[PDB]
């Protein structure tokens, strides 16, 4: 069976509340969907990013994927990476490749009649999640509500944003901690908001104020040296985490020497095929791995990562994916468990619902 | 004066022969063209890349640029970079920012009634070029005619491709040397075709076989340890050069520690605003700079770069620029001089040919 | 489907000729075979080493594998690795884990009715080999006969041994070059025979004498500083390779910074599940990968390794595998291609031959 | 338009009180003023230092600048630097070059009828300042009055001097914090007064004592190892800043690897042409930039510096510039805004006042 055709489409979905973090504001999410048909089946895969990702799939990647053996997604992946040298590998191009690869892996699993997790090397029956949102735009009550909600649903780890208005953050982390109590892990994400010495101040302060155990993207993160300084000088018990903007394997390799926990986003780092490589980087450096965003695809992919510590149950995406797809997984109890009776990703586009949000 | 409106369009032009290099084959070029309208004038900027670049400009950039002060392109650039964090800053996104930035600077120069070179900090009156082509697809005669042609025109530096069929390269470089004589500098580009020890072999072999002075992208430019190895071990008088694919200044900063000659492409590295930062990297590290591709923009932009060694007079681009614009400069005698009698880039779209090659 | 039973057996097969290399002499091969029974199917896997491996499988590993889910070999592997902390993880223990892991992957693939290469991520339809023998015990005729035979059989890469008697080696590499001609790659293996400066001498002498492309284990296995030194100072065109004694993923990570080509042996580095992590280490450091020994297993596993340069078609193992199993692959033409119709590894124990060689 | 002539004069202005810092005492300021005439316009530029700067301009620089294209200050700057290799590039030499470059930039902007900030690549509409003084010769009441006055004028950051009499500094920093209250940032400058371990003591001591967030030149800025030590070991939230004395860009490149915040003085670092390179250094290392001294020129020059954190509103210099010049900007509210209605730097010598302070 050969890959017959890719169909690309895009959707823009308003957030349920205006959102912000340390370095950005936004009020919608755009999903780019790839469907690959071949051998009488079809696979689906997606990324989040600009609408121009769809034009890039159609322009550079459709002619590479079409006609290919449907049973070997990594071979197409290799040809796709070679093809886009001039067109631009990182950013939009890498998001485009990740979407197609995920679709092609879903297509392969379905041609075999298997759940994707059983078409992949499998270390985990289920994977642990952390509930993630707590945007800097939320009033205290809504912050407390959202994180408390996840806690009571049996998710013992939650992440919130800091660093947009640093003077307001002490009260925000205290509020979060009071709502969830001592038994839940409290994680923060600065999204690149701090300078090095400011980051260093805040890592200490947040630890003292609310007993945080995780600090993500303290500094700009182009800033590898500042990451390494925070890794080396940060407080005990506060893991320094980064990696969402790493587009390639060599970048991931560099990053792994500067953090306590390495991150990658399956929708940016090259899809399933790319994410399959993070494991050797993380076992090699002996550090934990944490998946970033896109929970519905990550749940399958992360069953293959030995070094997984948790995946991110990111609010925007869990909501968009629940709205556009039938087949998403419920994080209740703190883990996602791929459904053994659904082949591939187990995800079906709800066509009329999505037509409503066409970009 | 304010930016009133951005117009984006794209053109695809067949190459005049099938073309290839060590790692890629192509038979056409796509230019994405931005026009910035404001204060009664119009600036233009462009990039070469995927048509999806135009959609990225429409979707993410036009809205930032519109309404902005027409006298301060860098203030817009900063707002553009901040705005695209989630949409993907490197690759397609960077190519888009670049095209828009060049258009905004063209516009500023025009509002001031100045050639672009005069609106920027100016170190150089004209700028030296090298003729660049010599694709691996060329039979020997056509390679000799292209290089000889440039030497006969008084351009004392030429670049060719190597590395696609390594067995054939010794006679291809010997043939090139015969065509140009002992007083034209012969430069090679491998476009990442070699492994580390392969590249070390060829740096020495090409020095002996044809007296080369320049070895570009011997290994993947993501491979900094490989580059550093070749910097340290390669023959005296062969400069190791790299740099087209970086999209952060810390990336350029990492590359500067690994090469003899740093390169950047004004249509990728963040436009004119991006290019202005390159001197600081190059003078800080004490290495020469060389501009990659897009001779028509680079002739102005490079007047502002103290550490300039030369700019690449790239065949594909020179040809597409003469075909699509009036006002392109002649490299006769080895340099490009901005026209003091034209404002901005001095470039005007030939709207007839434009339509012929509309994407 | 659960793993029901491991059965372990061992076979000693005399070499067809007395064999030696730079630091060892031997005249037989011992294979330790595991058979995993589950769900009405049987999987097989093996390693080469001391008979004690089989006792170690029985004593430490059977009790972990038995009762396990037969559809997720990596979950068992992680439990096996945890279990053997006091018993000794590297060496015999790793060889034991490698054998069990391969049998569990064979069992997994066969319960699905798929060829093993199609139950793994797959970048390659077939994989390139080099012919490997040329022992230091061979008279010149025999040496020329073996390497030339491989060359005529369509294998354009061959490896011989050096370093046992360095005064004799110049005539031996020359005789080898003379037999195969200029169009076959000639590779050598010192098996740890040299001191640092001796190795540097020979790397250059062998390059001048016979255009060798490849020098494996020039110094002792444990000597990383010496490898990195030969890597940094060795001649152009000669790849320095090592990795056959690497038992674990962090070791592989350390070695990757020291070599031109990284090697691992599927029967030592933790079987299929361990080999799957090698690709992220190689693409991370941007170096090629080369599989060492056991070509019957490696043909399937290496289809999943994007960074694969070649696999070693090692005389002793090709011979033993052909004697003991039905279903081995022919490297005629220079590559090994997993048979798309046979489930698992496609390997069947020949009971009566097995019986003749029982250890 | 050509540079017709350069005139040079000098002025000495006593301080309004006797002044000292950790390593110097002084009671006047000397400004060296350069005026450049061409195309019916007049540019003005200056530096602070020894009267002999004047003589150096006359002896080495006026003959280079005179006759030059008045639209290209950087080309003159490059020729000035080449010319003074034997006469001494750093110190006096650099201050002289700086003053001429500022004058020539003022001239270009004027010949274009633009405010200098508009004649430069421009990132910032206005620029934030900190009030800088707090000399170690001031009694507590004098100290509190100056800093408190800056605070009550809406300037939310102030710097004082420490280290001259270390015993006295706890009471002095406590007195300064009392005067400004808890919302004003308190910065300190040691002017190279401490040893390494002494500087380490005081960084912690001042943070506990008065909540300082900035520690400038704790050790000699020639001592990079000690700066790096204080950067690595200093308390979180206390930025380590240095850089007033570098004269070459690789010096700045070196210092950038040692501090939290990099500083340069536009009147020492090669003027406007030298400052335009600082962004490449700072962005390349992901650190902030802070301008030192000469607020009249910096209000303009720093508009071109994307990495700008703040400029120094240095007491002596704000006072001298007010005295000798028409057109100075007011810092009430915390920023300086170049006047859009006035071209070049907006400054004109008060001839009567100047005569009284003629050197
Ligand atoms: Na190139
Ligand atoms: Na100072």
Tab-separated table of N, CA and C and ligand atoms in Angstrom, chain B residues 159 161 189-191 216-217 244-245 263 292 312, ligand 1:
chain	number	residue	atom	x	y	z
B	159	UNK	N	32.912	31.092	-7.377
B	159	UNK	CA	32.542	29.870	-6.626
B	159	UNK	C	31.783	28.805	-7.431
B	161	UNK	N	30.121	24.426	-7.142
B	161	UNK	CA	29.703	23.318	-6.304
B	161	UNK	C	30.567	22.070	-6.463
B	189	UNK	N	31.860	25.059	-2.754
B	189	UNK	CA	30.769	24.945	-1.833
B	189	UNK	C	30.282	23.497	-1.869
B	190	UNK	N	30.242	22.841	-0.696
B	190	UNK	CA	29.899	21.407	-0.614
B	190	UNK	C	28.438	21.231	-0.147
B	191	UNK	N	27.833	22.329	0.322
B	191	UNK	CA	26.448	22.313	0.792
B	191	UNK	C	26.202	21.127	1.727
B	216	UNK	N	33.226	26.082	1.545
B	216	UNK	CA	31.992	26.408	2.207
B	216	UNK	C	31.143	25.153	2.568
B	217	UNK	N	30.606	25.146	3.793
B	217	UNK	CA	29.699	24.090	4.228
B	217	UNK	C	30.213	22.681	3.960
B	244	UNK	N	24.619	30.354	6.245
B	244	UNK	CA	23.228	30.670	5.798
B	244	UNK	C	21.986	30.287	6.656
B	245	UNK	N	22.062	29.291	7.526
B	245	UNK	CA	20.815	28.831	8.140
B	245	UNK	C	20.545	29.264	9.563
B	263	UNK	N	29.022	33.704	7.299
B	263	UNK	CA	28.118	34.093	6.247
B	263	UNK	C	26.754	34.331	6.815
B	292	UNK	N	25.527	36.018	1.668
B	292	UNK	CA	25.070	34.863	0.900
B	292	UNK	C	23.764	35.240	0.155
B	312	UNK	N	28.077	37.353	-2.444
B	312	UNK	CA	27.865	36.313	-3.438
B	312	UNK	C	26.951	36.826	-4.555
E	1	LIG	NA1	26.132	27.072	0.512
